[PDB]
Amino acid sequence: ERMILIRGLTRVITFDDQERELEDADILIDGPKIVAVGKNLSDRSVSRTIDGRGMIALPGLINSHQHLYEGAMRAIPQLERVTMASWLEGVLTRSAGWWRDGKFGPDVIREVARAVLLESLLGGITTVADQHPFFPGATADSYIDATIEAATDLGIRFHAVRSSMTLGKSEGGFCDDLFVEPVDRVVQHCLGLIDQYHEPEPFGMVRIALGPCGVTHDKPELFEAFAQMAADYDVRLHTHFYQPLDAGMSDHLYGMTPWRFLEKHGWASDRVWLAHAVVPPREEIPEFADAGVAIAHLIAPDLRLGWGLAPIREYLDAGITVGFGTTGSASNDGGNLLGDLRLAALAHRPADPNEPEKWLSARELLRMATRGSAECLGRPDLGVLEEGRAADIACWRLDGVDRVGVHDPAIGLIMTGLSDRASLVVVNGQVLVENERPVLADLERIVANTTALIPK
Numbered sequence: 001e002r003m004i005l006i007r008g009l010t011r012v013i014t015f016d017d018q019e020r021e022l023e024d025a026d027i028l029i030d031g032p033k034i035v036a037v038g039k040n041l042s043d044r045s046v047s048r049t050i051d052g053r054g055m056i057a058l059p060g061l062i063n064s065h066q067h068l069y070e071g072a073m074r075a076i077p078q079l080e081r082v083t084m085a086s087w088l089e090g091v092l093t094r095s096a097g098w099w100r101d102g103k104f105g106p107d108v109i110r111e112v113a114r115a116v117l118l119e120s121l122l123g124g125i126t127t128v129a130d131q132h133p134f135f136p137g138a139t140a141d142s143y144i145d146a147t148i149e150a151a152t153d154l155g156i157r158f159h160a161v162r163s164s165m166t167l168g169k170s171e172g173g174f175c176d177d178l179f180v181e182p183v184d185r186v187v188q189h190c191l192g193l194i195d196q197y198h199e200p201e202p203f204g205m206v207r208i209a210l211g212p213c214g215v216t217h218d219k220p221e222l223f224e225a226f227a228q229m230a231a232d233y234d235v236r237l238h239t240h241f242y243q244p245l246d247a248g249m250s251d252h253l254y255g256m257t258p259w260r261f262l263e264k265h266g267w268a269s270d271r272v273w274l275a276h277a278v279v280p281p282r283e284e285i286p287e288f289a290d291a292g293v294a295i296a297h298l299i300a301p302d303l304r305l306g307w308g309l310a311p312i313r314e315y316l317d318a319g320i321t322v323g324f325g326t327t328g329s330a331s332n333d334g335g336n337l338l339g340d341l342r343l344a345a346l347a348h349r350p351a352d353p354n355e356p357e358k359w360l361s362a363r364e365l366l367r368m369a370t371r372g373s374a375e376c377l378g379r380p381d382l383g384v385l386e387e388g389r390a391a392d393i394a395c396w397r398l399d400g401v402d403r404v405g406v407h408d409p410a411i412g413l414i415m416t417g418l419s420d421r422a423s424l425v426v427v428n429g430q431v432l433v434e435n436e437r438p439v440l441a442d443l444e445r446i447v448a449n450t451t452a453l454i455p456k
């Protein structure tokens with residue numbers, strides 16, 4: 001009261017239940033929450049007014065699938081053109097080698113996370129779900145502590161997804177037994193993280209989720225423990241889903257499809273969101289919907305790894321929640337969620353060359369990146385510019401020379417531009433970016449410090 005007023009925004013995209021948009025309108029903020037969205041709001045109890053003229057405001061973008069530690073693994077010549085098998089082997093080899101050489105402990109990961117998460121804020125991303133699977137040694141080291149610390153320092157909203165690779169090469173697994181933890185170690189560790197960090201209240205800034213790498217990378221016992229843990233502590237469940245080699249490997253290991261696996265081990269529920277979902281059998285999609293599972297579309301790695309086009313239109317037709325994410329920077333290789341939406345806008349269209357009404361629109365993509373992702377993460381308090389939701393807001397300027405001649409500013413955010421840099425970004429009511437610059441973080445100092453720590 002002590003309120004913040006963003007006045008005169010040229011366009012507001014709400015993604016509320018009526019899909020309202022507004023022009024020349026205001027957003028009124030008090031503490032962590034939005035008070036009003038509308039024309040000519042009162043500045044009676046306002047301590048600060050921000051000039052929104054020439055900007056478009058959206059809900060803060062929500063990256064429902066990251067791997068922050070991979071920020072250290074960008075643009076590696078040997079991984080430029082690689083199929084999954086070679087790629088995965090190259091990432092595991094590097095994370096294991098750097099770690100054993102003392103170059104990749106929680107303290108390095110903290111600063112790599114700080115850089116990728118600051119990038120995220122600067123890209124208009126106000127919540128990130130990071131899935132960290134790398135816990136070498138005889139004790140679960142403090143990598144998630146490190147990412148939470150970075151996220152907390154920056155003030156970005158954060159879901160830490162505790163991942164693993166519990167299926168050993170012995171038992172038909174992919175990875176070296178250095179990455180393989182006993183299921184009880186993983187379960188024990190997750191219990192402690194929930195107790196220490198999880199903020200279940202509305203507008204909570206740190207949440208914990210439980211996330212096996214996959215149906216063919218983790219023991220079915222882990223899936224069931226997590227299903228129990230999620231019901232008892234009311235947290236959510238995350239895993240990869242229907243990557244191209246999965247159906248065959250699942251059949252080989254278990255004689256069932258990946259979806260049947262999930263059903264059998266307690267994961268066919270509305271506690272679950274699923275990464276990629278590139279190549280499910282079409283017949284199972286109605287079952288996804290009936291179960292209430294959510295799907296995060298990840299166009300950039302699906303393309304980069306040569307996997308192709310997830311049936312997103314089919315998911316939307318079926319009423320399935322669709323969110324959006326970047327995955328990690330070893331398979332993207334950036335954290336630029338907004339830019340990746342352009343990739344999706346365009347790459348999907350050749351699959352349906354004569355039915356353009358099937359193509360994903362700009363507004364559908366922006367909805368996936370905000371409300372959709374919010375729903376993946378089970379956050380009814382995010383992803384929507386309306387009274388009562390979190391004051392998580394991302395705004396871009398529309399008056400650049402590269403956006404001249406744009407007729408619809410929302411389509412324009414996808415279809416035009418030299419830069420995806422946000423102008424104004426608010427998280428939990430706190431202004432963190434203004435004039436395309438961090439207001440509390442030392443951008444240059446963060447770059448210098450993290451750069452020095454990247455393994456060479």
Ligand SMILES: [Zn+2]
Pocket residue numbers: 065067131240275327328
């Ligand atoms: Zn992933």
